Amino acid sequence: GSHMSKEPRDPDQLYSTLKSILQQVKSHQSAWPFMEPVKRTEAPGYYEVIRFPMDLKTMSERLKNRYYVSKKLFMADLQRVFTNCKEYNPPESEYYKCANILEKFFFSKIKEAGLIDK
Numbered sequence: 001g002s003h004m005s006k007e008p009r010d011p012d013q014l015y016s017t018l019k020s021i022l023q024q025v026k027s028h029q030s031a032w033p034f035m036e037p038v039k040r041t042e043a044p045g046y047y048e049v050i051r052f053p054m055d056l057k058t059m060s061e062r063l064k065n066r067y068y069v070s071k072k073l074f075m076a077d078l079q080r081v082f083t084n085c086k087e088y089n090p091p092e093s094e095y096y097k098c099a100n101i102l103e104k105f106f107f108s109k110i111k112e113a114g115l116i117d118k
C-alpha cells in the first residue's frame with residue numbers, strides 16, 4: 001500500500017497492528033506464563049511485588065473489542081506482562097528467559113509496525 005513503517009495513529013490500522021503482535025506473542029514459544037492468569041499464590045508473592053497484574057489472558061480479551069488504540073496503551077500492557085513477570089520470578093527459573101525472549105521479539109515487532117513509545 002504505502003511506504004511507511006512508523007505511524008500507528010489511526011485506530012483501524014493500529015487495531016490489527018496490535019492483533020498481529022498479540023497474535024504472535026500468544027503463538028510465540030515463550031508465552032505460557034502469560035496465557036494463563038497467575039493466581040496470587042502459585043507465584044513467589046504476587047499481590048505484593050505486582051501492583052498492576054496483567055496477563056495475555058486479558059490482553060487479547062481487550063484487543064478483540066478494540067480497547068488498545070493509541071501507542072503506550074498496548075505497549076504498556078505487553079511490558080506489564082514481561083516486566084512484572086521477571087519482577088516476581090527471580091532470575092533463576094526458565095520463565096525469566098521466556099519473558100526476555102518474547103520481550104525481544106515484541107520490541108522488534110512494534111519496530112516493524114511502528115508502535116514503540118519510550
Ligand SMILES: NCCCNc1ccccc1[N+](=O)[O-]
Nearest residue numbers: 033036037038042043044095
Ligand atoms: N501455569 C499457571 C501460569 C504460570 N504459572 C506460574 C504461576 C505463578 C508463578 C510462576 C508461574 N510460572 O513460571 O509458570
